Amino acid sequence: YLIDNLDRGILEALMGNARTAYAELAKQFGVSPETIHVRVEKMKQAGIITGARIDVSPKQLGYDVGCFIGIILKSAKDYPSALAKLESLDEVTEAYYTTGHYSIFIKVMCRSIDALQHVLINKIQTIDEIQSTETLIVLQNPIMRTIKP
Amino acid sequence: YLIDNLDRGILEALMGNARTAYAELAKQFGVSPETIHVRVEKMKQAGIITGARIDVSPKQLGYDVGCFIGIILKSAKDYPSALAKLESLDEVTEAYYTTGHYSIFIKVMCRSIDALQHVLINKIQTIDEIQSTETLIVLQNPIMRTIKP
Amino acid sequence: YLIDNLDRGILEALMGNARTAYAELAKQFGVSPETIHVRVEKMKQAGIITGARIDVSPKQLGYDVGCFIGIILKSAKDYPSALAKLESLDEVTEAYYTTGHYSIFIKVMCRSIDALQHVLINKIQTIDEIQSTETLIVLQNPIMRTIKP
Amino acid sequence: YLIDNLDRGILEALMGNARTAYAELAKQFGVSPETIHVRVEKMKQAGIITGARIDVSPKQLGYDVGCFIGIILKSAKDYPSALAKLESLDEVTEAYYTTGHYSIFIKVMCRSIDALQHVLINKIQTIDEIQSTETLIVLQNPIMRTIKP
Amino acid sequence: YLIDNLDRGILEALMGNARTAYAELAKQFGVSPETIHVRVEKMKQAGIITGARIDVSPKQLGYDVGCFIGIILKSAKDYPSALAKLESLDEVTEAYYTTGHYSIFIKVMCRSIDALQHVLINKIQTIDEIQSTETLIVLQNPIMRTIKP
Amino acid sequence: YLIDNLDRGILEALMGNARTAYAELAKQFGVSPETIHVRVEKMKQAGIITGARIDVSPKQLGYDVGCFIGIILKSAKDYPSALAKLESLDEVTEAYYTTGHYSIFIKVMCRSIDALQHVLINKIQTIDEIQSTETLIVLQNPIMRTIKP
Amino acid sequence: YLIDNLDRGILEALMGNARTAYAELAKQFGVSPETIHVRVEKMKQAGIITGARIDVSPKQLGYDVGCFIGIILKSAKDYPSALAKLESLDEVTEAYYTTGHYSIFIKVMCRSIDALQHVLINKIQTIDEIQSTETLIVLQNPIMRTIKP
Amino acid sequence: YLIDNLDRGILEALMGNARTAYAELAKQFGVSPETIHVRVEKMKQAGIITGARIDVSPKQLGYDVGCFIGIILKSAKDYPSALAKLESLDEVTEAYYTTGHYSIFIKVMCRSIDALQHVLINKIQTIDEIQSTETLIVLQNPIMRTIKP
Ligand SMILES: NC(=O)C[C@H](N)C(=O)O
Ligand SMILES: NC(=O)C[C@H](N)C(=O)O
Ligand SMILES: NC(=O)C[C@H](N)C(=O)O
Ligand SMILES: NC(=O)C[C@H](N)C(=O)O
Ligand SMILES: NC(=O)C[C@H](N)C(=O)O
Ligand SMILES: NC(=O)C[C@H](N)C(=O)O
Ligand SMILES: NC(=O)C[C@H](N)C(=O)O
Ligand SMILES: NC(=O)C[C@H](N)C(=O)O
Ligand SMILES: [Mg+2]
Ligand SMILES: [Mg+2]
Numbered sequence A, B, C, D, E, F, G, H: 001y002l003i004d005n006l007d008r009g010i011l012e013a014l015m016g017n018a019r020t021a022y023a024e025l026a027k028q029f030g031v032s033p034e035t036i037h038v039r040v041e042k043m044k045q046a047g048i049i050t051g052a053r054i055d056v057s058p059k060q061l062g063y064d065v066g067c068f069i070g071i072i073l074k075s076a077k078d079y080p081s082a083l084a085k086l087e088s089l090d091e092v093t094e095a096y097y098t099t100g101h102y103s104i105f106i107k108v109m110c111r112s113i114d115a116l117q118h119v120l121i122n123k124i125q126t127i128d129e130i131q132s133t134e135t136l137i138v139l140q141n142p143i144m145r146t147i148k149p
């Protein structure tokens, strides 16, 4: 699905506030309230727009220890089953199959280093395909934002 | 600012759909349409709720090359100045001060390897504090989700 | 257990000399010999004060080769049993579960490199969960001190 | 200064409790209350005994973040000057010149990751000799003990 | 087989264009069309000249993602059988037994990172002798040429 | 410029022998001696076909030491200037800007380790941008071949 | 066995030439031909002097490729048996149990990279305890000498 | 200068004992006392035989700390100047320009870790070209021997 500058204008608007009214964007882009409705709806079926949701701040919820963990597996064919075990875990918010040293690269979000220690040892490291982990503790997270379409 | 099980119930709901009706949640948890408005508003002044926005899929917008780049600097004191230069780059969506080998650990989102090559050489590696970069290219991103509060 | 500046004053005093008399600290902080007795006793049940002991110098006892060893295990779930085997060894004075490359990070204190070689090969490396060790020999240990509460 | 089995017997006792009575040890080993006073005093002038102090638990005093930091310098001759700057930092409890990758290997003791981040950026990495740091965060410290002489 | 400067002159000529006529090189080097024919033929039986072929450009055929992959095997004796499995794959254009970290170092030529991901996971990583891969994605390939005999 | 199965059929043939007759291929695929001339000529203006050349074996010409060298630079912005110096070296047959640890990844082809040592010290490492090199020496090169389009 | 400056004087002399006559050293150090005989003989039973032998030059015997190899074993307890297999090999001239990454660090002396390749693959890498090798090829060996007692 | 089986027979003999009699070797191989004198003398002018010297054991002379040090330089062109400074150090017994991570790979022979620490800091790391050292300490040296020609 290709994308007008009308589509981009809508996305910028609704990416900053989901509740900015379609009738205000019509006035703004010089189109009808109705095309705006339809543009948005095409982008939903395209899979571009995935939902409207409140954004939350994990830190102000007391997640003081976020980290990335590189997982090294005992053998590389083990990725699909390792992944299946990891995904059952709520502390794992992201996971990637990347270049470089690691088989899997994941983010886990934890409340304390005591919590992180319990997850590593008892939830992640017990996963039988896993030979080693290397976790990179976030001490500061100054930039967090979005693609600017 | 500590939260109770009503605060969580509200969050779980509005993190799935920003647009669900305060009036349904009132019926759901057995409370007043007005306590829900207020709880949400406190979490806002708390900084727990940061906004209501539509979520977008970069893949569907043609961002086929996600990467994490680890930045190593000429000397470690250089971190504030390198950060300042990187944050002006819109292709940098995230940045972390972490443990381990790198000074700064960033995500860039790009459309192609040709684009990514242009950004590395022209925008990132032209930054004068930066000794070397190591980019980890995402081939697969099977888990992307949120803290489940 | 929280801590006055009376508590800190006592700790500084008794951390430099266990035998500095309670009746001298009373004079010094303008309290009774009896509160000092009781402050110390609360900190003992708190677990803050762990004991009074003579400090010894391993070097003047002929421990010329101290080292840290990073242990890499064949698989990560192996930590609890590896640790249980290590702890039986008197040359292992410390052990840590850390971030980074190693599964376990330990200090061993030895008299000579001939001694260190015998321990590595015959006591540590015979531990069956262990795939590799990497030992960092201390050549100089210029700072050794304490948290300053 | 070489030690016999009376010297060890004395050490083992006073390393467990600084306060045990010379008079009990005399009865224990079958010697004079006065030879024990003297043996201890020689070990003191030998530098084998360095003091009698209370031991403190950092954890109970709220030091939840222990770490080892490996320091890499811009050039290796810089070791004496970097050491001098680090030793003025009270959060650095230990420092080693070791083998392997790092120029200086230090322990810092901190209350939180927020504190540790402040010390890294503001106190440690502002040291001008220092190219990069690599900090290993302690998640667990199951063995902490002494040479058993 | 040793090599005149006549041999080199012929090779330079025919390395730039296979179709440069033998009767033009005769004029050029002051020999007969017939020795040129025979020189070339000796170099063919020597194995120096391996063929005449059109050179193609993989990039203009839409190979946007070339890479090198370092293969680490579970055990080193495994090289011959790993290699035998790899060679069945058309995306593997080169392979080397090198010094350094890797057991095998290979080039694979792919159309997209989606393609590369499918090969890694399903063709290369399924090879049972393989413990890990590390792939170095080519972002730019500015020099590609030949030995200049 | 997209290609059909006639374009591939032509390529497969002329990549094996540049000299096979357009007239045989016409009979082979059931088309005109003249459409084959034209298809080839379009692929030429497309840049898909770059030439017809004889292939040479470096081994048979006495190049016993092939190597890949990873170049690390003093600062990453230095890549264009280091590249320019390397490309003047005829022993450098290939060069890549890749991911991972190195700034530039090159192939050099040499006759002996004595030669290779002379090139490293005298021609490559004299380049002023270059902090360090890491050369991977080819001991075996069992697969060398082409994209199979 | 402790060592006079007479002992050192003899060793320097006989280390440069085994055939420098005892009666010349007597004149030189102002002692008898007979003490010199006896000094040397004590050092032999001490094990200090191990033999008199011609020194050879491997390079002028056509050993163009010397190397060090770091051996990584599948598990660390495997050292004694790995070593026993290695020692049967004539190309292995030295072996060390060292700190750092490798289980065993060895020197092998070879005539060519073709020879080195055959040894690695067929003699060293077939040793079943071995997971990986990393070989450091000597390109230049400018200093080779002796302790100066 | 190529050698036959008489040349080898001579070498094998005199590499075991420099002092065995030319007259016994003549009887042994069935040749003239005089051809043996001559063969040896050619190998001398060839540079194959470099001397006859007594071999010494460093261990028995109290060298308990052998090490290999890998030297990394600030820039790679610095190799000739760093070498020149190192070769003036008598504790450096060997030095190599090798492949892999290090610029220079050296052996130092030392009596204690206290000595080795003094040499590193005061003699080696004071060399201004040197960014960092990595020393591998020998704990065991089970194989030490010669090419068997
Ligand atoms: N995630 C993976 O297994 C990819 C692997 N680290 C590579 O680059 O080859
Ligand atoms: N980002 C930083 O500079 C922190 C550094 N990687 C450390 O662990 O010490
Ligand atoms: N000690 C451990 O297993 C922790 C591990 N090295 C990590 O950082 O993931
Ligand atoms: N601390 C040092 O500078 C010693 C260095 N890491 C070495 O092993 O050579
Ligand atoms: N390809 C190999 O197995 C060689 C190995 N990486 C070495 O240098 O020892
Ligand atoms: N060649 C480069 O500078 C790219 C670098 N190795 C990276 O991955 O970021
Ligand atoms: N050779 C060994 O196994 C020693 C090991 N590399 C260590 O330093 O712990
Ligand atoms: N000693 C050197 O500078 C050579 C370097 N280690 C390389 O492999 O390229
Ligand atoms: Mg959102
Ligand atoms: Mg104490």
Ligand SMILES: [Mg+2]
Pocket (backbone or CB within 6 Å): E053, E054, E055, F053, F054, F055
């Ligand atoms: Mg060709």
Ligand SMILES: [Mg+2]
Pocket (backbone or CB within 6 Å): G053, G054, G055, H053, H054, H055
């Ligand atoms: Mg000798």
